Coordinates of C-alpha atoms and ligand atoms in Angstrom, one line a residue:
Chain D
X1 CA -10.1 -0.8 -26.0
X2 CA -11.1 -2.3 -22.6
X3 CA -11.6 -5.7 -21.2
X4 CA -13.0 -7.1 -18.0
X5 CA -10.6 -8.2 -15.3
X6 CA -9.1 -11.7 -15.6
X7 CA -10.8 -14.0 -13.1
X8 CA -8.5 -17.0 -12.9
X9 CA -5.1 -17.5 -11.3
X10 CA -1.7 -16.3 -12.5
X11 CA 1.7 -17.9 -12.0
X12 CA 5.1 -16.3 -12.3
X13 CA 7.0 -18.1 -15.1
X14 CA 10.4 -16.8 -13.8
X15 CA 11.9 -14.7 -11.1
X16 CA 11.0 -11.0 -11.6
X17 CA 14.1 -9.2 -13.0
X18 CA 15.4 -5.7 -12.9
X19 CA 15.5 -4.1 -16.3
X20 CA 18.4 -1.8 -17.4
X21 CA 16.1 1.1 -16.6
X22 CA 15.7 0.1 -13.0
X23 CA 12.2 -1.1 -13.6
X24 CA 11.0 -4.7 -13.1
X25 CA 9.8 -7.0 -15.9
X26 CA 7.5 -9.9 -14.9
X27 CA 6.2 -12.8 -17.0
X28 CA 3.0 -14.6 -15.9
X29 CA 1.1 -17.6 -17.1
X30 CA -2.7 -17.5 -17.0
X31 CA -4.7 -20.6 -16.2
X32 CA -8.1 -19.1 -17.3
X33 CA -10.0 -19.3 -20.5
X34 CA -11.9 -16.0 -20.2
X35 CA -9.2 -14.2 -22.3
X36 CA -8.9 -11.6 -23.7
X37 CA -9.0 -10.1 -20.3
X38 CA -7.4 -7.3 -18.1
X39 CA -4.4 -8.5 -16.0
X40 CA -4.7 -7.0 -12.4
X41 CA -1.3 -5.7 -11.5
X42 CA 0.1 -3.4 -8.9
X43 CA 2.7 -2.9 -6.3
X44 CA 2.1 -2.4 -2.6
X45 CA 4.1 -2.2 0.6
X46 CA 1.2 -3.5 2.7
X47 CA -0.7 -6.6 1.6
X48 CA -3.5 -5.9 4.1
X49 CA -4.5 -2.6 2.4
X50 CA -3.1 -3.0 -1.1
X51 CA -2.6 0.7 -1.1
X52 CA -0.8 1.2 -4.5
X53 CA 2.8 2.3 -4.7
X54 CA 4.9 2.8 -7.7
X55 CA 3.1 2.3 -11.0
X56 CA 2.6 0.0 -13.9
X57 CA 4.7 0.7 -17.0
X58 CA 2.7 -1.6 -19.3
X59 CA -0.3 0.4 -20.6
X60 CA -3.4 -1.9 -20.4
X61 CA -1.7 -5.3 -19.6
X62 CA -3.9 -8.0 -21.1
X63 CA -4.0 -11.7 -21.7
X64 CA -4.7 -11.8 -25.4
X65 CA -5.5 -15.5 -25.9
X66 CA -8.7 -17.4 -25.0
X67 CA -6.8 -20.6 -24.4
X68 CA -5.5 -21.7 -21.1
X69 CA -1.9 -21.3 -20.0
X70 CA -1.0 -18.4 -22.2
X71 CA 1.7 -16.0 -21.1
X72 CA 2.2 -12.3 -21.0
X73 CA 4.9 -9.9 -19.8
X74 CA 4.4 -6.7 -17.9
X75 CA 6.8 -4.0 -16.7
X76 CA 6.4 -2.2 -13.3
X77 CA 8.1 0.9 -11.9
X78 CA 8.7 -0.1 -8.2
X79 CA 9.1 2.4 -5.4
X80 CA 12.3 3.1 -3.5
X81 CA 13.0 0.4 -1.1
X82 CA 10.9 -2.7 -0.4
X83 CA 7.6 -3.6 -1.9
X84 CA 5.4 -6.4 -3.2
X85 CA 4.6 -7.2 -6.8
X86 CA 0.9 -8.2 -6.8
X87 CA -0.7 -10.0 -9.8
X88 CA -4.3 -10.9 -9.9
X89 CA -7.2 -10.3 -7.5
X90 CA -8.8 -12.3 -4.7
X91 CA -7.4 -15.2 -2.7
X92 CA -5.5 -16.6 -5.7
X93 CA -3.5 -13.4 -6.3
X94 CA 0.3 -14.0 -6.4
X95 CA 3.0 -11.9 -4.8
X96 CA 6.7 -11.5 -4.9
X97 CA 8.9 -9.3 -2.7
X98 CA 11.0 -6.7 -4.5
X99 CA 13.8 -4.5 -3.4
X100 CA 14.8 -1.4 -5.4
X101 CA 18.2 0.2 -4.7
Chain X
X1 CA -0.5 16.2 -3.2
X2 CA -2.4 14.9 -0.2
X3 CA -6.0 13.8 -0.7
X4 CA -8.6 15.9 1.1
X5 CA -11.7 14.2 2.4
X6 CA -14.9 16.2 2.9
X7 CA -18.0 15.1 4.7
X8 CA -21.5 16.5 4.9
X9 CA -23.5 17.2 7.0
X10 CA -21.2 18.0 9.9
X11 CA -24.0 16.8 12.3
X12 CA -27.3 15.0 11.9
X13 CA -30.2 14.9 14.5
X14 CA -32.7 12.1 13.8
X15 CA -35.3 10.1 15.7
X16 CA -35.0 6.3 16.2
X17 CA -36.1 4.5 13.1
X18 CA -35.4 7.2 10.5
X19 CA -33.4 6.5 7.3
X20 CA -30.4 8.7 6.9
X21 CA -27.7 9.4 4.3
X22 CA -24.3 11.0 4.7
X23 CA -21.8 12.2 2.1
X24 CA -18.1 11.8 1.7
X25 CA -16.2 13.5 -1.2
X26 CA -12.5 13.1 -2.0
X27 CA -10.4 15.6 -3.8
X28 CA -8.9 12.8 -6.0
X29 CA -10.5 9.7 -7.3
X30 CA -10.1 6.7 -5.1
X31 CA -11.0 4.2 -7.9
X32 CA -7.8 2.4 -8.8
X33 CA -8.1 1.4 -12.4
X34 CA -5.5 -1.4 -12.1
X35 CA -7.8 -3.6 -9.9
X36 CA -11.1 -1.5 -10.2
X37 CA -11.4 -1.1 -6.4
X38 CA -12.5 2.0 -4.6
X39 CA -10.0 2.6 -1.7
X40 CA -12.6 4.1 0.6
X41 CA -13.5 3.2 4.2
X42 CA -16.2 4.2 6.6
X43 CA -15.4 4.3 10.4
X44 CA -17.9 4.6 13.3
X45 CA -16.7 6.1 16.6
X46 CA -19.1 5.5 19.5
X47 CA -18.8 7.5 22.7
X48 CA -15.9 6.2 24.8
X49 CA -14.6 3.9 22.0
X50 CA -12.0 3.8 19.4
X51 CA -13.0 4.2 15.7
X52 CA -14.4 0.9 14.3
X53 CA -14.4 -0.1 10.7
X54 CA -17.9 -0.4 9.2
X55 CA -17.3 -0.5 5.4
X56 CA -14.2 -1.1 3.2
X57 CA -13.7 -1.1 -0.6
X58 CA -16.5 1.6 -0.5
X59 CA -19.2 -1.1 -0.2
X60 CA -17.9 -4.2 1.6
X61 CA -19.4 -4.7 5.1
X62 CA -17.0 -5.8 7.8
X63 CA -18.0 -8.8 9.9
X64 CA -20.8 -8.1 12.3
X65 CA -21.9 -5.0 10.5
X66 CA -25.7 -5.1 9.9
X67 CA -27.3 -4.8 6.5
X68 CA -28.9 -1.5 7.5
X69 CA -25.4 0.1 7.0
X70 CA -24.8 0.4 3.3
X71 CA -21.8 2.1 1.6
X72 CA -22.1 3.2 -2.0
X73 CA -20.5 5.5 -4.5
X74 CA -17.4 5.5 -6.6
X75 CA -14.5 7.7 -7.7
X76 CA -14.8 10.9 -5.7
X77 CA -18.4 10.7 -4.3
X78 CA -19.4 8.2 -1.6
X79 CA -22.4 7.7 0.5
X80 CA -23.1 5.9 3.8
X81 CA -26.8 5.0 4.3
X82 CA -28.4 3.8 7.6
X83 CA -31.8 2.4 6.6
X84 CA -33.3 2.4 10.1
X85 CA -31.4 4.3 12.8
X86 CA -31.1 2.8 16.3
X87 CA -30.2 4.7 19.5
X88 CA -27.1 2.6 19.8
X89 CA -25.9 4.0 16.4
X90 CA -25.1 7.4 18.0
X91 CA -21.5 8.1 16.9
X92 CA -19.3 10.2 14.7
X93 CA -18.8 8.6 11.3
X94 CA -15.6 9.2 9.5
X95 CA -14.7 8.3 5.9
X96 CA -11.1 7.5 5.1
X97 CA -9.1 7.1 1.9
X98 CA -6.4 4.5 1.7
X99 CA -5.7 5.1 -2.0
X100 CA -2.5 7.0 -1.3
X101 CA -0.1 7.7 1.6
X102 CA -0.6 9.6 3.7
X103 CA -4.0 8.2 4.6
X104 CA -6.5 11.0 5.3
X105 CA -9.8 11.1 7.1
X106 CA -12.9 13.3 6.6
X107 CA -14.1 15.7 9.3
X108 CA -16.9 13.4 10.3
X109 CA -20.7 13.4 10.5
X110 CA -21.9 13.5 14.0
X111 CA -25.1 11.3 14.3
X112 CA -27.2 12.7 17.2
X113 CA -30.3 10.9 18.4
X114 CA -33.2 13.0 19.5
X115 CA -36.2 10.7 19.2
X116 CA -8.7 -12.1 19.9
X117 CA -6.4 -9.4 18.4
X118 CA -5.5 -7.0 21.2
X119 CA -3.6 -3.7 20.9
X120 CA -3.0 -2.5 24.5
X121 CA -2.1 1.1 25.2
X122 CA -1.4 2.8 28.5
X123 CA -3.6 5.3 30.3
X124 CA -3.5 9.1 30.0
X125 CA -0.2 11.0 30.1
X126 CA 0.1 14.6 31.2
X127 CA 3.3 16.4 30.3
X128 CA 4.9 19.9 30.2
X129 CA 5.7 21.8 27.0
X130 CA 9.1 20.9 25.6
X131 CA 9.1 17.4 27.0
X132 CA 8.9 14.1 25.1
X133 CA 6.9 11.0 25.6
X134 CA 7.3 7.4 24.4
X135 CA 3.8 5.8 23.8
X136 CA 3.6 2.0 23.8
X137 CA 1.4 -0.5 21.9
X138 CA 1.5 -4.1 23.1
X139 CA 0.2 -6.5 20.4
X140 CA -1.2 -10.0 20.9
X141 CA -3.6 -12.5 19.3
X142 CA -1.9 -12.6 15.9
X143 CA 1.5 -13.1 14.2
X144 CA 3.1 -9.7 15.2
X145 CA 6.0 -9.6 12.7
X146 CA 4.5 -9.2 9.3
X147 CA 1.6 -6.8 9.9
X148 CA 2.2 -3.0 9.6
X149 CA 1.3 -1.1 12.8
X150 CA -0.1 2.4 12.2
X151 CA -0.4 5.4 14.5
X152 CA -3.3 7.9 14.4
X153 CA -3.8 11.2 16.2
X154 CA -7.3 12.5 17.0
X155 CA -8.2 15.8 18.7
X156 CA -11.6 16.0 20.5
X157 CA -14.4 15.2 18.1
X158 CA -12.2 15.9 15.1
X159 CA -11.0 14.0 12.0
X160 CA -8.3 11.5 12.8
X161 CA -4.8 12.1 11.3
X162 CA -2.6 9.3 10.1
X163 CA 0.9 9.7 11.6
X164 CA 2.7 6.9 9.9
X165 CA 3.4 3.2 10.1
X166 CA 6.2 0.7 10.9
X167 CA 6.7 -2.9 9.8
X168 CA 8.0 -4.9 12.7
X169 CA 9.9 -7.6 10.8
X170 CA 11.9 -5.3 8.6
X171 CA 11.7 -2.1 10.7
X172 CA 10.7 -0.2 7.6
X173 CA 8.7 2.9 8.1
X174 CA 6.5 5.4 6.3
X175 CA 5.8 8.8 7.8
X176 CA 3.2 11.4 7.1
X177 CA 5.3 14.4 6.1
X178 CA 3.4 16.5 8.7
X179 CA 4.8 14.3 11.5
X180 CA 8.2 13.4 10.1
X181 CA 10.0 15.4 12.9
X182 CA 7.3 15.0 15.6
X183 CA 7.1 11.2 15.8
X184 CA 9.6 8.4 15.7
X185 CA 8.4 4.8 15.3
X186 CA 10.3 1.9 16.7
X187 CA 9.6 -1.8 17.6
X188 CA 10.8 -4.3 20.2
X189 CA 10.4 -7.6 18.4
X190 CA 11.2 -9.5 21.6
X191 CA 8.1 -8.2 23.3
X192 CA 5.7 -7.6 20.3
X193 CA 5.9 -3.9 21.2
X194 CA 5.5 -0.9 19.0
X195 CA 6.6 2.6 20.2
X196 CA 6.0 6.1 19.0
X197 CA 8.2 8.8 20.6
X198 CA 6.7 12.3 20.4
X199 CA 9.3 15.1 20.7
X200 CA 9.2 18.8 21.5
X201 CA 5.7 18.6 23.0
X202 CA 3.3 21.6 22.7
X203 CA -0.4 22.0 23.4
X204 CA -1.0 21.4 19.7
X205 CA 0.1 17.8 20.4
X206 CA -2.7 17.2 23.0
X207 CA -4.8 14.4 21.5
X208 CA -5.7 10.8 21.8
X209 CA -3.0 8.7 20.0
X210 CA -4.1 5.3 18.6
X211 CA -2.0 2.4 17.4
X212 CA -3.9 0.4 14.8
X213 CA -3.8 -2.3 12.2
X214 CA -5.6 -0.5 9.5
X215 CA -7.5 -1.7 6.4
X216 CA -10.1 -4.1 5.0
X217 CA -11.0 -7.3 6.9
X218 CA -8.3 -7.0 9.5
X219 CA -8.9 -3.5 10.9
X220 CA -8.1 -3.3 14.7
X221 CA -7.6 -0.3 16.9
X222 CA -6.0 0.1 20.3
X223 CA -7.9 1.9 23.0
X224 CA -5.7 5.0 22.5
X225 CA -3.5 6.9 25.0
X226 CA -4.7 10.4 25.9
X227 CA -1.8 12.9 25.9
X228 CA -2.3 16.3 27.4
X229 CA 0.4 18.9 27.2
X230 CA 0.4 21.6 29.9
Ligands
LIG301 NA1 -13.8 -12.8 -22.0
LIG302 NA1 10.7 17.4 17.8

């Protein structure tokens, strides 16, 4: 099952939080109505290149509702040290700095 | 496992006005499923100049790049098309993957014709085997602190090699394993200066060393410092 990328803006509903596994859980609210759609999610150390680091734990993160302001959670496996959590694509993408150690 | 970039043909001799195609193949897919982008760039290096970004995200043209340059392809197979060659296009064209660290470049296609951001680097050094040298990179025209500064090594007419990068604000670094004991990156935040110290110099180190802000719509290269080891 596949979906096209979500096109609208995301917002963090709360501070990203370390899980007991050392991973990071993130909850986002989605302003769009094109759901169901694929949530763009990655981590990077360099926002200019967006070269991926770490990986997404959540297999196929999706917004499942077609109504605005629905929420979803995703889990990320951040790299050693400092990185950025990057949700969404384009100019309206959101970022949050993360430190793992 | 490092990604290997392969280009063909090694050289292309064409007359002005011809349409040409050149190929770039990666050993691993550069299509990142999370955001559906191809992390592939095309660089043009004219005589006497630093490499200049032409295409990023496999098909996005950088500002000022004419429509007659077209990047295409996806995954592991990419193509740069020049619809109508001009004499000024004479250059070596390099593809580069930025899907994974370390960044890697192809061996280049040499195009032969028959028919405010500043990164300032000093002039040539010449040194003896066993010595060390501290190369400098003076940055201006942008907010220095938050942009990664990369260092690149290029032997004559050969594929560039990504040495590593340093973030000035945090001092964080990422090194290519092949240079982890050869190069040391530091910054002087008070002077917007980036340094790369090369140790235990040998003739294998003789090359032009570039500092560069790499990637997408903010790609900028210094003029390079030529280092020759006796
Ligand atoms: Na939809
Ligand atoms: Na050394």
